[PDB]
Design a protein around this ligand. Sequence first.
Ligand code: HEM
Length: 187
Amino acid sequence: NLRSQRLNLLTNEPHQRLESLVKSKEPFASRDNFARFVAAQYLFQHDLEPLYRNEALARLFPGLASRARDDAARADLADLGHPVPEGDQSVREADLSLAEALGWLFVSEGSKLGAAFLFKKAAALELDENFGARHLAEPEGGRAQGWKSFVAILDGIELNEEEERLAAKGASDAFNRFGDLLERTFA
Ligand code: HEM
């Protein structure tokens, strides 16, 4: 019924595939490997920037701007001595509909879930919230409620059937994009 639940079903496979891809790149084998993972996160933030700063979406999601993680990820790349990668502008210039944008935000916000596990694994590489893993630090209100607050708004929006299709497309496209970014930074 809820939009969030439908999106969860629709992206269950892409998620399993993505989780497997991440495990295969061995992000915690070394700081260099971890840095390549941070580079992928950083590039995904560049794709999402125009959405987190969009006035229309900011009105729908109060506090939107502060959900971005670009400064932290860029600071982490600097800590790790990894040069910042160049964004290809493909998503920023894609001219996404509002509905597609909701699917991209769904995936970006959802990608924060379980980050405490990644944060814990980063400790093995002697990294933490003040060095190298700044982008995985837990948010103020806590990961849980941050997600619950976002989903309540998402599920309340009224969309027509075409817009629902576009939101699903946006979520699918975002999962595929993160995978492309990982293949790029680990190449
Ligand atoms: C770019 C997309 C995403 C990436 C890169 C991603 C990656 C991951 C990874 C690698 C893990 C395993 C963490 C660990 O090592 O323990 C994971 C766990 C998880 N992901 Fe995602 N994810 C993404 C999007 C999403 C979305 C959209 C949702 C939800 C709508 C989601 C929900 C979860 C949850 C619930 C867990 C398990 C958390 C727990 O066990 O407490 N993820 N994800």
